[PDB]
Amino acid sequence: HHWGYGKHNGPEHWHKDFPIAKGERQSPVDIDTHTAKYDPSLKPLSVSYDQATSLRILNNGHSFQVTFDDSQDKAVLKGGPLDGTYRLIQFHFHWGSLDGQGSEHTVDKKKYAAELHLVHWNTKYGDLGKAVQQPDGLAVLGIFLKVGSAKPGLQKVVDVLDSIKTEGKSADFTNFDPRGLLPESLDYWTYPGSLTTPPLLECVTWIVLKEPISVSSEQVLKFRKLNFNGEGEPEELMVDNWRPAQPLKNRQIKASFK
Ligand SMILES: [Zn+2]
Ligand SMILES: [Zn+2]
């Protein structure tokens, strides 16, 4: 029972191998806009992706992922609620079997069509190994996708998906600019949480953007062509690869905007 998203190995089963799944600071959560309170002390987010160097794109059996060279301070995230500078290591997506669902975070219980996660680690903790042991060792920038006009910045990604259809396939993926994946506003919500996949470590400062990016139906249709399965294995279409909202428990969600 390697983990997945189906009836027999999905999010309801994860706690058996990773008991932190019933922990105190699990993600995603629902963001209720009545209770997510504006914090005037929150600094604007600093996203510097201009020197990002992408390495590869891969189907890992739970999503598709684009990886980055994190050997030095090129593509970094800082400011906002964050201490120190955070290096981008990868991004991936979550999406649904139809446009009406797919995002992991929700806003006033509304599910978006997809959710993009840009994963960064805190350099003040030396390496990724020591970072994930710390409550703010990772920062994940979360961005909602809604269906509308095409995002030109997403095109180079979706157009190579046919080359990584099944679990375990990968391809060289150089000179991709993650700047093209961002909405206009960097207005955000932030709270302390976890990885939304095993091992579910409670090491993430979540930064979820208020403004969704719009992507075309054509584009999101390319997401749904991916497989959970390996090459030549019976088809398990990669859709609904999202963990549902987990209990907020004691936590406060802060808004950077009024
Ligand atoms: Zn994996
Ligand atoms: Zn994710």
PDB file of C-alpha atoms and ligand atoms in Angstrom:
ATOM      1  CA  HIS A   1       0.000   0.000   0.000  1.00  0.00           C
ATOM      2  CA  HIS A   2       2.326   2.700  -1.322  1.00  0.00           C
ATOM      3  CA  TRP A   3       0.415   5.938  -0.977  1.00  0.00           C
ATOM      4  CA  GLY A   4      -1.779   7.600  -3.588  1.00  0.00           C
ATOM      5  CA  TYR A   5      -5.102   9.383  -3.963  1.00  0.00           C
ATOM      6  CA  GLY A   6      -7.578   6.556  -4.574  1.00  0.00           C
ATOM      7  CA  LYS A   7     -10.105   4.716  -2.371  1.00  0.00           C
ATOM      8  CA  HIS A   8      -7.591   2.210  -1.125  1.00  0.00           C
ATOM      9  CA  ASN A   9      -4.471   4.327  -0.617  1.00  0.00           C
ATOM     10  CA  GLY A  10      -5.643   7.946  -0.530  1.00  0.00           C
ATOM     11  CA  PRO A  11      -5.540  10.745   2.107  1.00  0.00           C
ATOM     12  CA  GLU A  12      -7.782   8.814   4.559  1.00  0.00           C
ATOM     13  CA  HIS A  13      -5.137   6.069   4.768  1.00  0.00           C
ATOM     14  CA  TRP A  14      -1.974   8.212   5.062  1.00  0.00           C
ATOM     15  CA  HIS A  15      -1.942   8.420   8.874  1.00  0.00           C
ATOM     16  CA  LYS A  16      -1.143   4.693   9.150  1.00  0.00           C
ATOM     17  CA  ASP A  17       2.334   5.198   7.685  1.00  0.00           C
ATOM     18  CA  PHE A  18       2.638   8.872   8.631  1.00  0.00           C
ATOM     19  CA  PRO A  19       0.790   9.456  11.931  1.00  0.00           C
ATOM     20  CA  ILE A  20       1.592  13.189  11.705  1.00  0.00           C
ATOM     21  CA  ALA A  21      -1.297  13.210   9.239  1.00  0.00           C
ATOM     22  CA  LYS A  22      -3.513  13.781  12.306  1.00  0.00           C
ATOM     23  CA  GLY A  23      -1.076  16.356  13.668  1.00  0.00           C
ATOM     24  CA  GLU A  24      -1.672  19.900  14.914  1.00  0.00           C
ATOM     25  CA  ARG A  25      -0.504  21.846  11.859  1.00  0.00           C
ATOM     26  CA  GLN A  26      -1.567  19.893   8.774  1.00  0.00           C
ATOM     27  CA  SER A  27      -2.188  21.336   5.295  1.00  0.00           C
ATOM     28  CA  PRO A  28      -4.079  22.273   3.233  1.00  0.00           C
ATOM     29  CA  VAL A  29      -6.777  24.194   5.091  1.00  0.00           C
ATOM     30  CA  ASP A  30      -9.873  26.165   4.200  1.00  0.00           C
ATOM     31  CA  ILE A  31      -9.243  29.930   4.265  1.00  0.00           C
ATOM     32  CA  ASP A  32     -12.365  31.588   5.686  1.00  0.00           C
ATOM     33  CA  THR A  33     -12.194  35.278   4.739  1.00  0.00           C
ATOM     34  CA  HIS A  34     -14.137  36.313   7.840  1.00  0.00           C
ATOM     35  CA  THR A  35     -11.525  34.884  10.171  1.00  0.00           C
ATOM     36  CA  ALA A  36      -8.370  35.358   8.122  1.00  0.00           C
ATOM     37  CA  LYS A  37      -7.465  38.685   9.698  1.00  0.00           C
ATOM     38  CA  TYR A  38      -5.416  41.452   8.083  1.00  0.00           C
ATOM     39  CA  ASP A  39      -1.998  41.936   9.697  1.00  0.00           C
ATOM     40  CA  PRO A  40      -0.610  45.396   8.905  1.00  0.00           C
ATOM     41  CA  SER A  41       2.770  44.194  10.152  1.00  0.00           C
ATOM     42  CA  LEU A  42       3.135  41.713   7.296  1.00  0.00           C
ATOM     43  CA  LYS A  43       5.807  42.769   4.792  1.00  0.00           C
ATOM     44  CA  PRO A  44       5.299  42.558   1.025  1.00  0.00           C
ATOM     45  CA  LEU A  45       6.482  39.282  -0.481  1.00  0.00           C
ATOM     46  CA  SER A  46       9.777  39.317  -2.402  1.00  0.00           C
ATOM     47  CA  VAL A  47       9.848  36.928  -5.378  1.00  0.00           C
ATOM     48  CA  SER A  48      13.104  36.960  -7.376  1.00  0.00           C
ATOM     49  CA  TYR A  49      12.853  34.357 -10.131  1.00  0.00           C
ATOM     50  CA  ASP A  50      14.870  36.200 -12.804  1.00  0.00           C
ATOM     51  CA  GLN A  51      17.973  34.008 -12.429  1.00  0.00           C
ATOM     52  CA  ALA A  52      16.127  30.725 -11.941  1.00  0.00           C
ATOM     53  CA  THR A  53      17.644  27.714 -13.665  1.00  0.00           C
ATOM     54  CA  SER A  54      15.262  24.829 -14.253  1.00  0.00           C
ATOM     55  CA  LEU A  55      16.743  21.371 -14.631  1.00  0.00           C
ATOM     56  CA  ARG A  56      14.170  18.691 -15.357  1.00  0.00           C
ATOM     57  CA  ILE A  57      10.494  17.868 -15.610  1.00  0.00           C
ATOM     58  CA  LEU A  58       9.143  14.548 -14.338  1.00  0.00           C
ATOM     59  CA  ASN A  59       6.079  12.420 -13.673  1.00  0.00           C
ATOM     60  CA  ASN A  60       6.594  11.143 -10.118  1.00  0.00           C
ATOM     61  CA  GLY A  61       3.301   9.248  -9.981  1.00  0.00           C
ATOM     62  CA  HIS A  62       1.573  11.870  -7.822  1.00  0.00           C
ATOM     63  CA  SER A  63       2.016  15.006  -9.930  1.00  0.00           C
ATOM     64  CA  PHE A  64       4.280  16.497 -12.552  1.00  0.00           C
ATOM     65  CA  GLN A  65       7.262  18.381 -11.174  1.00  0.00           C
ATOM     66  CA  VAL A  66       9.749  20.891 -12.574  1.00  0.00           C
ATOM     67  CA  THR A  67      13.053  20.992 -10.703  1.00  0.00           C
ATOM     68  CA  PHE A  68      15.549  23.823 -10.199  1.00  0.00           C
ATOM     69  CA  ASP A  69      19.232  24.253  -9.445  1.00  0.00           C
ATOM     70  CA  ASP A  70      19.255  25.375  -5.814  1.00  0.00           C
ATOM     71  CA  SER A  71      23.042  25.346  -5.392  1.00  0.00           C
ATOM     72  CA  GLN A  72      23.188  29.122  -4.984  1.00  0.00           C
ATOM     73  CA  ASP A  73      20.949  32.125  -4.328  1.00  0.00           C
ATOM     74  CA  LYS A  74      19.363  32.547  -7.744  1.00  0.00           C
ATOM     75  CA  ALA A  75      15.597  32.008  -7.639  1.00  0.00           C
ATOM     76  CA  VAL A  76      14.724  33.000  -4.094  1.00  0.00           C
ATOM     77  CA  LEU A  77      11.760  33.937  -1.937  1.00  0.00           C
ATOM     78  CA  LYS A  78      12.053  36.358   0.965  1.00  0.00           C
ATOM     79  CA  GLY A  79      10.195  39.055   2.864  1.00  0.00           C
ATOM     80  CA  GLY A  80       6.576  38.477   3.784  1.00  0.00           C
ATOM     81  CA  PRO A  81       6.385  36.441   6.998  1.00  0.00           C
ATOM     82  CA  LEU A  82       9.753  34.823   6.285  1.00  0.00           C
ATOM     83  CA  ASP A  83      13.067  34.839   8.139  1.00  0.00           C
ATOM     84  CA  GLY A  84      16.107  34.536   5.904  1.00  0.00           C
ATOM     85  CA  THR A  85      16.172  33.644   2.230  1.00  0.00           C
ATOM     86  CA  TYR A  86      14.479  30.611   0.704  1.00  0.00           C
ATOM     87  CA  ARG A  87      15.708  28.802  -2.424  1.00  0.00           C
ATOM     88  CA  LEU A  88      13.291  27.361  -5.001  1.00  0.00           C
ATOM     89  CA  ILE A  89      13.842  23.632  -5.506  1.00  0.00           C
ATOM     90  CA  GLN A  90      10.734  22.576  -7.455  1.00  0.00           C
ATOM     91  CA  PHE A  91       7.165  23.265  -8.490  1.00  0.00           C
ATOM     92  CA  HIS A  92       4.254  20.930  -9.126  1.00  0.00           C
ATOM     93  CA  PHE A  93       0.471  20.928  -9.464  1.00  0.00           C
ATOM     94  CA  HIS A  94      -2.728  19.472  -8.034  1.00  0.00           C
ATOM     95  CA  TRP A  95      -5.923  19.260 -10.066  1.00  0.00           C
ATOM     96  CA  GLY A  96      -9.326  17.643 -10.456  1.00  0.00           C
ATOM     97  CA  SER A  97     -11.345  15.289 -12.643  1.00  0.00           C
ATOM     98  CA  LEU A  98     -13.433  18.330 -13.677  1.00  0.00           C
ATOM     99  CA  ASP A  99     -13.007  22.139 -13.599  1.00  0.00           C
ATOM    100  CA  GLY A 100     -15.140  22.486 -10.454  1.00  0.00           C
ATOM    101  CA  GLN A 101     -12.481  20.959  -8.177  1.00  0.00           C
ATOM    102  CA  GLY A 102      -8.714  20.375  -7.897  1.00  0.00           C
ATOM    103  CA  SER A 103      -7.189  22.899  -5.496  1.00  0.00           C
ATOM    104  CA  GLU A 104      -5.992  21.830  -2.063  1.00  0.00           C
ATOM    105  CA  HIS A 105      -6.570  25.085  -0.221  1.00  0.00           C
ATOM    106  CA  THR A 106     -10.094  26.470  -0.494  1.00  0.00           C
ATOM    107  CA  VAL A 107     -11.364  29.968   0.066  1.00  0.00           C
ATOM    108  CA  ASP A 108     -14.701  30.192   1.828  1.00  0.00           C
ATOM    109  CA  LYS A 109     -15.069  26.493   0.940  1.00  0.00           C
ATOM    110  CA  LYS A 110     -14.677  27.250  -2.801  1.00  0.00           C
ATOM    111  CA  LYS A 111     -12.453  24.775  -4.699  1.00  0.00           C
ATOM    112  CA  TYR A 112     -10.390  26.117  -7.632  1.00  0.00           C
ATOM    113  CA  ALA A 113      -9.679  24.073 -10.758  1.00  0.00           C
ATOM    114  CA  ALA A 114      -6.033  23.549  -9.812  1.00  0.00           C
ATOM    115  CA  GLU A 115      -3.299  24.617  -7.424  1.00  0.00           C
ATOM    116  CA  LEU A 116       0.363  25.324  -8.147  1.00  0.00           C
ATOM    117  CA  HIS A 117       2.969  24.852  -5.393  1.00  0.00           C
ATOM    118  CA  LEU A 118       6.375  26.463  -5.631  1.00  0.00           C
ATOM    119  CA  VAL A 119       8.507  24.789  -2.976  1.00  0.00           C
ATOM    120  CA  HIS A 120      11.410  26.655  -1.329  1.00  0.00           C
ATOM    121  CA  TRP A 121      13.824  25.788   1.502  1.00  0.00           C
ATOM    122  CA  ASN A 122      15.308  28.121   4.147  1.00  0.00           C
ATOM    123  CA  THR A 123      19.045  28.667   3.553  1.00  0.00           C
ATOM    124  CA  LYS A 124      19.512  29.816   7.159  1.00  0.00           C
ATOM    125  CA  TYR A 125      19.234  26.119   8.060  1.00  0.00           C
ATOM    126  CA  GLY A 126      22.207  25.166   5.859  1.00  0.00           C
ATOM    127  CA  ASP A 127      20.745  22.279   3.846  1.00  0.00           C
ATOM    128  CA  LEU A 128      17.393  20.740   2.883  1.00  0.00           C
ATOM    129  CA  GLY A 129      18.017  17.908   5.345  1.00  0.00           C
ATOM    130  CA  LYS A 130      18.080  20.169   8.397  1.00  0.00           C
ATOM    131  CA  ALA A 131      15.442  22.540   6.991  1.00  0.00           C
ATOM    132  CA  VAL A 132      12.527  20.069   6.940  1.00  0.00           C
ATOM    133  CA  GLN A 133      13.008  19.426  10.657  1.00  0.00           C
ATOM    134  CA  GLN A 134      12.161  23.055  11.400  1.00  0.00           C
ATOM    135  CA  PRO A 135       8.624  24.537  11.512  1.00  0.00           C
ATOM    136  CA  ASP A 136       9.648  27.228   9.017  1.00  0.00           C
ATOM    137  CA  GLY A 137      12.236  25.185   7.156  1.00  0.00           C
ATOM    138  CA  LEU A 138      10.171  25.304   3.939  1.00  0.00           C
ATOM    139  CA  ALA A 139       8.127  28.060   2.376  1.00  0.00           C
ATOM    140  CA  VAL A 140       5.530  27.064  -0.181  1.00  0.00           C
ATOM    141  CA  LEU A 141       4.026  29.681  -2.459  1.00  0.00           C
ATOM    142  CA  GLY A 142       0.550  28.464  -3.357  1.00  0.00           C
ATOM    143  CA  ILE A 143      -1.262  29.787  -6.418  1.00  0.00           C
ATOM    144  CA  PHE A 144      -4.786  28.935  -7.478  1.00  0.00           C
ATOM    145  CA  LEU A 145      -5.675  28.168 -11.079  1.00  0.00           C
ATOM    146  CA  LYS A 146      -9.080  29.089 -12.514  1.00  0.00           C
ATOM    147  CA  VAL A 147     -10.209  28.346 -16.081  1.00  0.00           C
ATOM    148  CA  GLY A 148     -10.342  31.300 -18.481  1.00  0.00           C
ATOM    149  CA  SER A 149      -7.741  32.903 -20.736  1.00  0.00           C
ATOM    150  CA  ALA A 150      -4.525  30.988 -21.396  1.00  0.00           C
ATOM    151  CA  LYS A 151      -1.409  31.701 -19.365  1.00  0.00           C
ATOM    152  CA  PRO A 152       1.458  32.084 -21.859  1.00  0.00           C
ATOM    153  CA  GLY A 153       3.886  31.256 -19.065  1.00  0.00           C
ATOM    154  CA  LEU A 154       2.254  27.845 -18.575  1.00  0.00           C
ATOM    155  CA  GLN A 155       2.453  26.833 -22.268  1.00  0.00           C
ATOM    156  CA  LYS A 156       6.064  25.539 -22.264  1.00  0.00           C
ATOM    157  CA  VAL A 157       5.139  23.215 -19.406  1.00  0.00           C
ATOM    158  CA  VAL A 158       1.885  21.746 -20.729  1.00  0.00           C
ATOM    159  CA  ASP A 159       3.360  21.319 -24.203  1.00  0.00           C
ATOM    160  CA  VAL A 160       5.964  18.851 -22.946  1.00  0.00           C
ATOM    161  CA  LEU A 161       3.547  16.800 -20.827  1.00  0.00           C
ATOM    162  CA  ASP A 162       3.036  14.269 -23.618  1.00  0.00           C
ATOM    163  CA  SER A 163       6.686  13.268 -23.220  1.00  0.00           C
ATOM    164  CA  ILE A 164       6.149  12.408 -19.515  1.00  0.00           C
ATOM    165  CA  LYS A 165       2.742  10.685 -19.655  1.00  0.00           C
ATOM    166  CA  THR A 166       3.444   7.832 -17.240  1.00  0.00           C
ATOM    167  CA  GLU A 167       4.969   7.471 -13.768  1.00  0.00           C
ATOM    168  CA  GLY A 168       8.753   7.565 -13.835  1.00  0.00           C
ATOM    169  CA  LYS A 169       9.252   9.348 -17.157  1.00  0.00           C
ATOM    170  CA  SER A 170      11.276  12.550 -17.186  1.00  0.00           C
ATOM    171  CA  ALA A 171      12.913  14.994 -19.574  1.00  0.00           C
ATOM    172  CA  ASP A 172      15.572  17.697 -19.667  1.00  0.00           C
ATOM    173  CA  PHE A 173      13.713  20.960 -19.011  1.00  0.00           C
ATOM    174  CA  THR A 174      16.042  23.953 -19.175  1.00  0.00           C
ATOM    175  CA  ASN A 175      15.628  27.728 -19.228  1.00  0.00           C
ATOM    176  CA  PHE A 176      12.047  27.747 -18.006  1.00  0.00           C
ATOM    177  CA  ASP A 177      11.119  31.047 -16.355  1.00  0.00           C
ATOM    178  CA  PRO A 178       8.772  30.551 -13.358  1.00  0.00           C
ATOM    179  CA  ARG A 179       8.005  34.301 -13.467  1.00  0.00           C
ATOM    180  CA  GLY A 180       5.366  33.462 -16.077  1.00  0.00           C
ATOM    181  CA  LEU A 181       3.363  31.461 -13.526  1.00  0.00           C
ATOM    182  CA  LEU A 182       2.596  34.389 -11.232  1.00  0.00           C
ATOM    183  CA  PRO A 183      -0.559  36.512 -10.961  1.00  0.00           C
ATOM    184  CA  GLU A 184      -0.446  40.350 -10.960  1.00  0.00           C
ATOM    185  CA  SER A 185      -0.922  40.815  -7.211  1.00  0.00           C
ATOM    186  CA  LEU A 186       1.309  39.317  -4.550  1.00  0.00           C
ATOM    187  CA  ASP A 187      -1.366  39.894  -1.902  1.00  0.00           C
ATOM    188  CA  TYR A 188      -1.312  36.771   0.296  1.00  0.00           C
ATOM    189  CA  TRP A 189      -2.554  34.699   3.234  1.00  0.00           C
ATOM    190  CA  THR A 190      -0.039  32.958   5.493  1.00  0.00           C
ATOM    191  CA  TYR A 191      -0.203  30.248   8.225  1.00  0.00           C
ATOM    192  CA  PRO A 192       2.097  27.507   9.618  1.00  0.00           C
ATOM    193  CA  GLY A 193       1.461  24.111   8.062  1.00  0.00           C
ATOM    194  CA  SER A 194       2.727  20.954   6.462  1.00  0.00           C
ATOM    195  CA  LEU A 195       3.693  19.205   3.280  1.00  0.00           C
ATOM    196  CA  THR A 196       0.411  18.086   1.697  1.00  0.00           C
ATOM    197  CA  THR A 197       1.941  14.785   0.633  1.00  0.00           C
ATOM    198  CA  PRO A 198       3.786  12.096   2.593  1.00  0.00           C
ATOM    199  CA  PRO A 199       5.812  12.473   4.676  1.00  0.00           C
ATOM    200  CA  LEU A 200       3.498  15.386   5.668  1.00  0.00           C
ATOM    201  CA  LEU A 201       6.183  17.114   7.751  1.00  0.00           C
ATOM    202  CA  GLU A 202       5.021  20.159   9.698  1.00  0.00           C
ATOM    203  CA  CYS A 203       7.787  22.334   8.336  1.00  0.00           C
ATOM    204  CA  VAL A 204       6.089  24.772   5.960  1.00  0.00           C
ATOM    205  CA  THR A 205       5.313  28.437   6.144  1.00  0.00           C
ATOM    206  CA  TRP A 206       2.404  28.594   3.727  1.00  0.00           C
ATOM    207  CA  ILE A 207       2.039  31.638   1.520  1.00  0.00           C
ATOM    208  CA  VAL A 208      -1.157  31.403  -0.516  1.00  0.00           C
ATOM    209  CA  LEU A 209      -1.809  34.135  -3.074  1.00  0.00           C
ATOM    210  CA  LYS A 210      -5.174  35.886  -3.141  1.00  0.00           C
ATOM    211  CA  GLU A 211      -5.245  36.257  -6.921  1.00  0.00           C
ATOM    212  CA  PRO A 212      -5.673  33.078  -8.990  1.00  0.00           C
ATOM    213  CA  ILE A 213      -3.936  32.835 -12.346  1.00  0.00           C
ATOM    214  CA  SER A 214      -6.222  32.166 -15.296  1.00  0.00           C
ATOM    215  CA  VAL A 215      -5.326  29.192 -17.486  1.00  0.00           C
ATOM    216  CA  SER A 216      -7.277  27.956 -20.496  1.00  0.00           C
ATOM    217  CA  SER A 217      -9.456  24.865 -20.570  1.00  0.00           C
ATOM    218  CA  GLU A 218      -7.071  23.577 -23.256  1.00  0.00           C
ATOM    219  CA  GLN A 219      -4.185  23.925 -20.847  1.00  0.00           C
ATOM    220  CA  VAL A 220      -5.812  22.187 -17.875  1.00  0.00           C
ATOM    221  CA  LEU A 221      -6.994  19.441 -20.236  1.00  0.00           C
ATOM    222  CA  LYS A 222      -3.314  18.600 -20.749  1.00  0.00           C
ATOM    223  CA  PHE A 223      -2.907  18.033 -16.986  1.00  0.00           C
ATOM    224  CA  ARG A 224      -5.656  15.411 -17.108  1.00  0.00           C
ATOM    225  CA  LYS A 225      -3.830  13.348 -19.735  1.00  0.00           C
ATOM    226  CA  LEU A 226      -1.191  12.280 -17.229  1.00  0.00           C
ATOM    227  CA  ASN A 227      -1.177   8.819 -15.641  1.00  0.00           C
ATOM    228  CA  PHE A 228      -0.628   7.703 -12.042  1.00  0.00           C
ATOM    229  CA  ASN A 229       0.575   4.418 -13.469  1.00  0.00           C
ATOM    230  CA  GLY A 230       3.810   3.343 -15.118  1.00  0.00           C
ATOM    231  CA  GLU A 231       4.338   2.747 -18.823  1.00  0.00           C
ATOM    232  CA  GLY A 232       2.350  -0.237 -20.084  1.00  0.00           C
ATOM    233  CA  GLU A 233       0.505  -0.607 -16.778  1.00  0.00           C
ATOM    234  CA  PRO A 234      -3.314  -0.426 -16.745  1.00  0.00           C
ATOM    235  CA  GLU A 235      -4.433   3.183 -17.032  1.00  0.00           C
ATOM    236  CA  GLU A 236      -4.962   5.088 -13.794  1.00  0.00           C
ATOM    237  CA  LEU A 237      -5.579   8.653 -14.988  1.00  0.00           C
ATOM    238  CA  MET A 238      -3.836  11.286 -12.877  1.00  0.00           C
ATOM    239  CA  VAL A 239      -6.780  13.372 -11.718  1.00  0.00           C
ATOM    240  CA  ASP A 240      -8.005  14.427  -8.263  1.00  0.00           C
ATOM    241  CA  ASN A 241      -4.500  14.370  -6.908  1.00  0.00           C
ATOM    242  CA  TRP A 242      -5.414  16.779  -4.093  1.00  0.00           C
ATOM    243  CA  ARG A 243      -5.549  16.352  -0.323  1.00  0.00           C
ATOM    244  CA  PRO A 244      -8.727  17.823   1.159  1.00  0.00           C
ATOM    245  CA  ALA A 245      -8.740  20.634   3.759  1.00  0.00           C
ATOM    246  CA  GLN A 246      -7.464  19.545   7.185  1.00  0.00           C
ATOM    247  CA  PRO A 247      -8.546  20.908  10.595  1.00  0.00           C
ATOM    248  CA  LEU A 248      -7.160  24.370  11.352  1.00  0.00           C
ATOM    249  CA  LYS A 249      -7.044  23.513  15.040  1.00  0.00           C
ATOM    250  CA  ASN A 250      -5.410  26.321  17.032  1.00  0.00           C
ATOM    251  CA  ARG A 251      -3.931  28.179  14.055  1.00  0.00           C
ATOM    252  CA  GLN A 252      -4.379  31.753  12.859  1.00  0.00           C
ATOM    253  CA  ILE A 253      -4.396  32.552   9.149  1.00  0.00           C
ATOM    254  CA  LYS A 254      -3.108  36.092   8.490  1.00  0.00           C
ATOM    255  CA  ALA A 255      -3.951  38.254   5.502  1.00  0.00           C
ATOM    256  CA  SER A 256      -1.404  40.732   4.106  1.00  0.00           C
ATOM    257  CA  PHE A 257      -4.184  42.853   2.631  1.00  0.00           C
ATOM    258  CA  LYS A 258      -7.232  44.773   3.799  1.00  0.00           C
TER     259      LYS A 258
HETATM  260 ZN    ZN B   1       7.161  10.801  -4.730  1.00  0.00          ZN
HETATM  261 ZN    ZN B   2       1.695  20.328  -3.567  1.00  0.00          ZN
END
